[PDB]
CSV table of C-alpha atoms in Angstrom, one decimal:
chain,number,residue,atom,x,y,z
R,5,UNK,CA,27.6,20.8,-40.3
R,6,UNK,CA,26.4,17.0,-40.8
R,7,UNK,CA,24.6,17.1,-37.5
R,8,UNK,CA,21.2,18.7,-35.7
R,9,UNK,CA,19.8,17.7,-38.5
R,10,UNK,CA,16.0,18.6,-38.2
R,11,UNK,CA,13.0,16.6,-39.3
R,12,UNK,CA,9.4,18.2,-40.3
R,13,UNK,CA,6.5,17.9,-42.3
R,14,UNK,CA,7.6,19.7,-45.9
R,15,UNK,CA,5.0,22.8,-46.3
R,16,UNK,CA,4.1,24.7,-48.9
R,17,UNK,CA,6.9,26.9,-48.0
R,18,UNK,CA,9.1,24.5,-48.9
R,19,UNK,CA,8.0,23.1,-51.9
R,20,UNK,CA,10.2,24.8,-54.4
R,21,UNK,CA,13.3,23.7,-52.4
R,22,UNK,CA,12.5,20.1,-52.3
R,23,UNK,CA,11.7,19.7,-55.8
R,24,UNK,CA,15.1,21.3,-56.5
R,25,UNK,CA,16.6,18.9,-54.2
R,26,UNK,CA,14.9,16.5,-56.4
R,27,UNK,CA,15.9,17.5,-60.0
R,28,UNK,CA,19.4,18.2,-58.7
R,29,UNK,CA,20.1,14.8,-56.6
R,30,UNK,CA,17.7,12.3,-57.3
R,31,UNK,CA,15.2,12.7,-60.8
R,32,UNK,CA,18.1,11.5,-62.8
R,33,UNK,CA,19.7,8.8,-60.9
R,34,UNK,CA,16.9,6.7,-59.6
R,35,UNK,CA,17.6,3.3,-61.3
R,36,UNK,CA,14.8,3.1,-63.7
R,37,UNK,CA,14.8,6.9,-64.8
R,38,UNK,CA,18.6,6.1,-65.3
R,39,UNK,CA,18.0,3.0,-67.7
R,40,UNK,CA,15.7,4.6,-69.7
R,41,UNK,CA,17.8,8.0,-69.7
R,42,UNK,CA,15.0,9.9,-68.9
R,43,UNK,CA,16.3,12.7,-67.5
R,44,UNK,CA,19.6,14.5,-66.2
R,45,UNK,CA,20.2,16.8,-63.3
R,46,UNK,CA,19.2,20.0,-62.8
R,47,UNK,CA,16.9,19.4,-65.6
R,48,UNK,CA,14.2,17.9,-64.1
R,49,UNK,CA,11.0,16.4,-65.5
R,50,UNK,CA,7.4,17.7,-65.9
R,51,UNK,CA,5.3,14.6,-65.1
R,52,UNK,CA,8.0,13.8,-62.3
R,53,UNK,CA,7.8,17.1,-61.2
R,54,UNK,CA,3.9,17.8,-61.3
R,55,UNK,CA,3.9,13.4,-60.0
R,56,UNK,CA,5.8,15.0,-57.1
R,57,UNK,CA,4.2,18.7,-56.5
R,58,UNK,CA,0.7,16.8,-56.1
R,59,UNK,CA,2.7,14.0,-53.3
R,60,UNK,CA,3.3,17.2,-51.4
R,61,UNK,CA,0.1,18.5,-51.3
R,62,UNK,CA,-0.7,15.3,-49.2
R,63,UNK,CA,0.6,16.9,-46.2
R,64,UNK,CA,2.5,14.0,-45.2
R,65,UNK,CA,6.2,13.8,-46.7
R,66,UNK,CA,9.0,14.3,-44.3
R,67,UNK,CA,12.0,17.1,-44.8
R,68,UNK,CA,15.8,16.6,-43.2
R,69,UNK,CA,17.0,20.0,-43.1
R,70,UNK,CA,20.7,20.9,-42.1
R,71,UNK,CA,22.1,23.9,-40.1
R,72,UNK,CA,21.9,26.4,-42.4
R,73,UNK,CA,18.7,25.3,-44.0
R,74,UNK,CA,19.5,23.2,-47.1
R,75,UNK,CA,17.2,20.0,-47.5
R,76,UNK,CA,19.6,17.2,-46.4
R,77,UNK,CA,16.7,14.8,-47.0
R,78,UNK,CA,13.3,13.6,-48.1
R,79,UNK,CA,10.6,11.1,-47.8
R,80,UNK,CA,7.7,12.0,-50.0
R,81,UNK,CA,4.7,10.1,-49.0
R,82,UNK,CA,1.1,10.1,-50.4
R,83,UNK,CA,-1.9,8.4,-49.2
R,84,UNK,CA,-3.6,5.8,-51.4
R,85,UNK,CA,-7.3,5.4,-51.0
R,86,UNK,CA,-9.1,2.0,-51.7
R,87,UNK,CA,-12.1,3.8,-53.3
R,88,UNK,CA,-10.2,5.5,-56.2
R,89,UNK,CA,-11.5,4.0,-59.9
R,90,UNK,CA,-8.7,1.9,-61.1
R,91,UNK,CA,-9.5,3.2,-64.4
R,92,UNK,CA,-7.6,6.5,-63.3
R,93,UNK,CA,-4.3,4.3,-64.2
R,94,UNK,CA,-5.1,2.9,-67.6
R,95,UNK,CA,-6.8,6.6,-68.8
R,96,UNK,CA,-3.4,7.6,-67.2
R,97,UNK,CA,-1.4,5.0,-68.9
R,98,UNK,CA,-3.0,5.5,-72.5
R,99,UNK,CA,-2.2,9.4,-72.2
R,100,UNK,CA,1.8,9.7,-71.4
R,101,UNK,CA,3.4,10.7,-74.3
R,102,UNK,CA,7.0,10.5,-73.1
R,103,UNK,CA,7.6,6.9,-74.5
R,104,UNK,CA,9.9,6.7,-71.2
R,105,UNK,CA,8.0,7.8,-68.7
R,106,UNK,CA,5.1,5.1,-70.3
R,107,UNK,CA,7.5,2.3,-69.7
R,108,UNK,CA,7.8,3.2,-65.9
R,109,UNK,CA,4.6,3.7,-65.2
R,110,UNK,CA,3.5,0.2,-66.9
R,111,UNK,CA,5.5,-2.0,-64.6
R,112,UNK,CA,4.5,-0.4,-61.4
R,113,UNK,CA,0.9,-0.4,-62.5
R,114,UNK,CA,1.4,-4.2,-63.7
R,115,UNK,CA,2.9,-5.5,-60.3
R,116,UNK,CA,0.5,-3.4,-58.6
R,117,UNK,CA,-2.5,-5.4,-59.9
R,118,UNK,CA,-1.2,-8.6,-58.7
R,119,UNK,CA,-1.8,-8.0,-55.4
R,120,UNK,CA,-4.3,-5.9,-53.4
R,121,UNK,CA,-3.1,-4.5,-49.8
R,122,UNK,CA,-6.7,-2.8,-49.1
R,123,UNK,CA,-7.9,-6.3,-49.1
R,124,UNK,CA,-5.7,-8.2,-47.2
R,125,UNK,CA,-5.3,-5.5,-44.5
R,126,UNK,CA,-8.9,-4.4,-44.9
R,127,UNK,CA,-8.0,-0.5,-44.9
R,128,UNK,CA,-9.6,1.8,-46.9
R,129,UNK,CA,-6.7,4.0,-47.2
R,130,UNK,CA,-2.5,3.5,-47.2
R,131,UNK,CA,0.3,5.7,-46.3
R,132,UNK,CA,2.8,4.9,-49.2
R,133,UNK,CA,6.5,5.9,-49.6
R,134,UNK,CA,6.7,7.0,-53.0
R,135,UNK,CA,10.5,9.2,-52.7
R,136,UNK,CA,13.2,8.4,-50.6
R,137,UNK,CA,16.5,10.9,-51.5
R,138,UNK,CA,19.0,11.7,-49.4
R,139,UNK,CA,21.8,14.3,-50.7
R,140,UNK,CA,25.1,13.3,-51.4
R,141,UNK,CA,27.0,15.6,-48.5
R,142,UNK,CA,24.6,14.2,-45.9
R,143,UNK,CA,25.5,10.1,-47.0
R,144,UNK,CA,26.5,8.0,-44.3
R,145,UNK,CA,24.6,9.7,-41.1
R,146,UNK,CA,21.8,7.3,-41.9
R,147,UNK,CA,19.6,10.0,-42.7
R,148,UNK,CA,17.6,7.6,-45.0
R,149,UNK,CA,16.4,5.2,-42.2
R,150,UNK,CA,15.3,8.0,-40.1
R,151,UNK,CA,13.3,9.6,-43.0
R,152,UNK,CA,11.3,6.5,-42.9
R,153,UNK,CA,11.4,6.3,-38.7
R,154,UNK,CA,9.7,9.3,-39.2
R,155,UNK,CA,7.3,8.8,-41.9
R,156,UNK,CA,6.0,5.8,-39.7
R,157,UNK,CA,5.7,8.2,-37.0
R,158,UNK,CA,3.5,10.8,-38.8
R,159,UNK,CA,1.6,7.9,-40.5
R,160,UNK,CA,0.9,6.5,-37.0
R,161,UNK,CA,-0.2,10.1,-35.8
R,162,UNK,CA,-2.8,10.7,-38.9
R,163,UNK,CA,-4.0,7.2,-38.1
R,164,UNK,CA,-2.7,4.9,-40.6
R,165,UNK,CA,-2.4,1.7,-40.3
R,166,UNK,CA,-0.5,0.5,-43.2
R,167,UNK,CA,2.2,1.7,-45.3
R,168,UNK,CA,3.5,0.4,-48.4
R,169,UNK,CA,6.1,1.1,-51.2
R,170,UNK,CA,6.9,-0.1,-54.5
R,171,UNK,CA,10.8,0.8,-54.3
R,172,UNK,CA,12.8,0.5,-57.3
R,173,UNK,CA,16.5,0.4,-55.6
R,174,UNK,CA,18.4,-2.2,-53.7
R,175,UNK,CA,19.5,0.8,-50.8
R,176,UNK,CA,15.7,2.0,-49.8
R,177,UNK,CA,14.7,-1.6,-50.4
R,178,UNK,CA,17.3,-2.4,-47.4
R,179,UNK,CA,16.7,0.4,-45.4
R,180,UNK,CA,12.6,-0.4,-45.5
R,181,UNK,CA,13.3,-4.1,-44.9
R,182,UNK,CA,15.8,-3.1,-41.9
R,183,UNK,CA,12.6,-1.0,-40.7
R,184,UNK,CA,10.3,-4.3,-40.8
R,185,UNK,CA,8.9,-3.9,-44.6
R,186,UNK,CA,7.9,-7.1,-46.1
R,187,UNK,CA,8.0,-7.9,-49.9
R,188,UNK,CA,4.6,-8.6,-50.9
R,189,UNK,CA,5.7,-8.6,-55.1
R,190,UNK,CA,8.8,-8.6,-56.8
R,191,UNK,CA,10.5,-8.8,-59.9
R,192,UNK,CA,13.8,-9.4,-61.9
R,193,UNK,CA,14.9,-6.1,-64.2
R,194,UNK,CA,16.5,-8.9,-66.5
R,195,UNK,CA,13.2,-11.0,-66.5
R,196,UNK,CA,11.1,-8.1,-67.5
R,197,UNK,CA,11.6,-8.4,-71.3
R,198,UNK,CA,9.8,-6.7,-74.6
R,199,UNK,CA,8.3,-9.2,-77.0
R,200,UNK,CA,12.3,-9.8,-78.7
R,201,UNK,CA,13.2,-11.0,-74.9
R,202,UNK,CA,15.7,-7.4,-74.6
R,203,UNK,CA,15.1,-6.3,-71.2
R,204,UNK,CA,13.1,-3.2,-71.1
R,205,UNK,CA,15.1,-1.8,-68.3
R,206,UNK,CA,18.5,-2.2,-68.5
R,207,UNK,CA,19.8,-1.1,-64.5
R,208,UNK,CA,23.2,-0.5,-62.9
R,209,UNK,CA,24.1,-2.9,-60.2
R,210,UNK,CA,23.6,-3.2,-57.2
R,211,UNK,CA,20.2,-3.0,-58.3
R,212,UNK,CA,18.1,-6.1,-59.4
R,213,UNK,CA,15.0,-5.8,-58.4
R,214,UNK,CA,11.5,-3.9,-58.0
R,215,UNK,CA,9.6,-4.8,-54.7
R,216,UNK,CA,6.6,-4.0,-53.5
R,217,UNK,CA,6.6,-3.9,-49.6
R,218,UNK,CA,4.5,-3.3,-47.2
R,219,UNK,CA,3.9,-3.1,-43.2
R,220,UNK,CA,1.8,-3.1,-40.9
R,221,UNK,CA,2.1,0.0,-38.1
R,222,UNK,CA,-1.0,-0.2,-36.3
């Protein structure tokens, strides 16, 4: 049944599940992971997956479970802290050895450093979307938009005051933006090039951009 639908803070419990959900519905067809064929369902990914496990153990993403318990939904959240030495990233950065993976993690690490959100909102920490998947059964019952309704709600609750998320896909970019998300950064995928102007991402349409977006809750 495709309704009472649940929503609740994904546990421990739950953890296996939701990466499944992940490797099965979402790893492999997220635009940029697509252009760069990193992946293919089912098969999953182990930076993605450990990238993912340690988003969990936030305590903040959000589970849409059906009926009969299968994960309809998820927004996996983590919570970005102001203090945290930006020379994590480049030590980060300089240590992928998936050639892919490195190409994804450069351009959200690039846009991220032209702006800074902890400044502009003064916050020292920020509640930031980082998955938004919805299982192909469950499309249509706008189960994405009330993943985020809820996120906000849970952010609101642990006392956050901005979230923020650097979304790769024109459908969670218009979902977020329906939800009062502003674009703080953005870019073309056919104006990021390599030094012999070929894109490095080559995407699918609808999607054409990566946008950093961000509101204020509280």
């Amino acid at each position: 049944k495709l309704n009472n639908i649940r929503f609740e803070t994904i546990s421990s419990k739950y953890y296996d599940d939701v990466i499944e959900h992940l490797r099965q519905t979402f790893f492999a067809d997220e635009p940029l992971n697509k252009a760069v064929n990193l992946t293919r369902p089912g098969q999953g990914h182990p930076l993605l997956e450990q990238h993912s496990l340690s988003t969990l153990k936030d305590n903040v993403s959000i589970m849409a479970i059906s009926n009969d318990g299968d994960i309809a939904g998820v927004a996996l959240n983590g919570i970005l802290y102001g203090n945290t030495d930006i020379e994590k990233s480049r030590e980060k950065l300089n240590e992928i050895q998936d050639e892919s993976f490195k190409k994804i993690f450069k351009l959200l690490y690039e846009q991220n450093l032209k702006i800074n959100l902890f400044k502009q909102f003064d916050v020292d920490k920020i509640f930031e979307i980082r998955i938004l998947s919805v299982d192909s059964r469950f499309r249509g019952k706008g189960l994405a938009k009330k993943l985020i309704e809820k996120s906000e709600e849970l952010a609101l609750d642990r006392g956050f005051q901005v979230m923020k998320t650097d979304a790769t896909g024109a459908f969670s970019q218009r979902v977020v933006s329906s939800l009062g998300f502003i674009t703080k950064c953005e870019i073309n995928y056919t104006d990021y090039l390599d030094e012999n102007g070929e894109q490095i991402f080559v995407v699918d349409p609808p999607h054409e951009k990566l946008k950093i977006m961000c509101k204020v809750i509280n």
